[PDB]
Amino acid sequence: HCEEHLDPLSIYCEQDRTLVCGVCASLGSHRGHRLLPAAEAQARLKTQLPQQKMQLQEASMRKEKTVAVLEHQLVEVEETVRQFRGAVGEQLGKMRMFLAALESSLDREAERVRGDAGVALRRELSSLNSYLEQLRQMEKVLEEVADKPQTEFLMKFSLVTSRLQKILSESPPPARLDIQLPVISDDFKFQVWKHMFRHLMPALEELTFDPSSAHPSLVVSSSGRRVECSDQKAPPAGEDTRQFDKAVAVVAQQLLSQGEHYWEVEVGDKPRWALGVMAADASRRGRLHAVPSQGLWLLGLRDGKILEAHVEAKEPRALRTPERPPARIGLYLSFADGVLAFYDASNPDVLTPIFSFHERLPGPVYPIFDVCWHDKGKNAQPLLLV
Amino acid sequence: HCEEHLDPLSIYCEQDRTLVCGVCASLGSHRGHRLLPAAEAQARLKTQLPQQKMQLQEASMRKEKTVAVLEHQLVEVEETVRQFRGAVGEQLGKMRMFLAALESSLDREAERVRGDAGVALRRELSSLNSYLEQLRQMEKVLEEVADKPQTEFLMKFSLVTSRLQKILSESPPPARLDIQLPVISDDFKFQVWKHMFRHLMPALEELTFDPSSAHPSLVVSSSGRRVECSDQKAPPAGEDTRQFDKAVAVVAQQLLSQGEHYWEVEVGDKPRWALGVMAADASRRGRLHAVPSQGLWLLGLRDGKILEAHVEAKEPRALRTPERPPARIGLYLSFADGVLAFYDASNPDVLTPIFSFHERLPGPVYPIFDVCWHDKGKNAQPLLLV
Ligand SMILES: [Zn+2]
Ligand SMILES: [Zn+2]
Ligand SMILES: [Zn+2]
Ligand SMILES: [Zn+2]
């Protein structure tokens, strides 16, 4: 039953795995092959069956493994798309909400201005309208009684004279102040955009200084909000990893480890200071090396107008100092983006950036504040936690 | 009818303007006054009447003029409130529109990603499911055939072996499918805010150069969008104040006189160039003085990386050159705020400021572009009007 050479099917090619006839084995598909008979070939395959069953089941198992992983991936793709869309909506609705609130506030402004102006104008209008009624009566009665008996004539004339005299010699309205309603012209959109940044910042990280960590020559007041140096000698710090010994500074009690945070520090006219974050595991001993590899991310100002960033280098990098020694610094921290950014927050409405590090933070960090050395009393400025 | 002394009323008090009887005029409230009789008093007042009526008319005229002025003031206050509300609505709807458009674009992108991922995953699932059906058929036939004729048994066993071999060597990826799905981060708000500025700008002032004013050593192409110098000589400039003759430059055909405008100029790697505005009354002849007092507001770049602002002084002011030579400059102009602002538009999506003039402009001005000289063919870069 060869169906190709018309012989019974008796020869089995091993290296071809096909049952054949004699002609294809003599001069055909199997001229130089390893041949076997059909009987012992069948007897071999009846024993080879379990291996084939095992291999079939294993192949099905692998393909099913891939099916399961891919369907789980389909569910994961759906869920990730949902999360992306929802978070985009949330973080754009934040700014849209800011816009709606500002427009509502401006509507309040305009309505209040209109109401007060209308109140004052209608007050004067009522006064003048009563006045006009008075005067119309004056003219009518004078004309109508300029023919009456002498007694009536003189009485009415005297009354008219008195009424006209007083209403002419009446005191004007007292002194009000206008509510001008300042008008917006072109830069209003730009200023709204500038103002939106402060609201883009997260809720203020309400921090307090940790006197349990401060230098012994420092003093903390205002319930953890004020740190300053002193013009007097102090006992040396007790043996502790949680206390500075040479560089006068202090960390906050709160440990930042997740999410995003923002805090402002008031520095005023301080000639030298330093601000930033510090790795919690870092060592607070000796004169410090200001490099991020040692757990120190610091922005400094020296000599009153020299603003320095303590970058990974041999000497801290200088920065383009603003037109003033900044009076308030703002610090933004994010782990999901690994950034600590510095801002000149002297303007409560606009923040201008100063510097920002770019390193996936090992975490966690303590807010660190370097109120600089005594300098013989020429650096008595404090640090104020806003 | 004195009703207080019960006498007829006959005496008129001059300094009091009141009719009285004889007793109160003799020794009473009007005892030492200048008195007159009722007859001559009436004869005087009947002739004084027209003057009093005239004075009444004058007072009425004053009060009615004031009433009219106050009603006009009320109406003007109403209209001013309307205008204020409308302008606030317009300039906030700009940003709301940007937000909505960005959110819709991101939603479209995310939906495209989800659809493509679903298509690919269902493709792989169909492939693997057809494979599993094949393998179930393999197992079925293997279980059913272990007694059949030599031809049937060996034929089907060889076919099963071949099919399993082929589907094993045509194996799809055993792993999961790459998706690179969009993630939402903390910096999304900051990036949207940075992007919002370019859309806060007005619609691009699509400008065309004015060949009627350019230097004869210049050439305008690309339908008014491209201006270049030439590496070959040209005829001397024709007699016109409205044509540059010595300083190679060109103004736009459009005249800016009111409102706000914004236009971008692509400069690429051009080493020296200048951009800005020029007063229409200014003279475009001879060697020019680059000072706003002579109607020229210009920012220039020389030596490829030296960015200077041609401010009102004896020497051009230096500027903070960026870490790159800017590839596109943006110019914003406003009259109601008197500002000409320059931006590094090398990124057309985010703008970093470069300089800004601050003068309520005398007006009006033509956008002027100083495409610098050939420099012996080493300054052949063009100026491209976006
Ligand atoms: Zn063979
Ligand atoms: Zn054959
Ligand atoms: Zn009397
Ligand atoms: Zn009297």
Residue numbers in the entry:
A (entry chain B), B (entry chain A): 85 to 470
From the reporting publication:
The coiled-coil domains (CCDs) form the main scaffold of an antiparallel dimer with a length of approximately 17 nm. In the middle of the CCDs, the structural core consists of the hendecad repeated region of the H1:H1′ helices (prime indicates the second protomer of the dimer) and the H3:H3′ helices followed by a pair of PRYSPRY domains. Between the H1:H1′ helices and PRYSPRY domains, the H3:H3′ helices are sandwiched to interact with both domains. Recent cryo-electron microscopy (EM) analysis of TRIM72 and the crystal structure of TRIM72 ΔRING also revealed that the CCD ends are dynamic. These results suggest that the flexibility of long TRIM CCDs is suitable for recognizing curved cellular structures, such as phospholipid membranes and viral capsids, and filamentous structures, such as dsRNA and DNA.
Tripartite motif-containing protein (TRIM)72 (mitsugumin 53; MG53) has been determined to rapidly nucleate vesicles at the site of membrane damage, but the underlying molecular mechanisms remain poorly understood. TRIM72 is a member of the class IV TRIM proteins, which is the largest subtype among the 11 groups of TRIM proteins. Its domain organization includes an RBCC domain followed by a PRY motif associated with a SPRY domain identified in splA kinase and ryanodine receptors (PRYSPRY) domain.
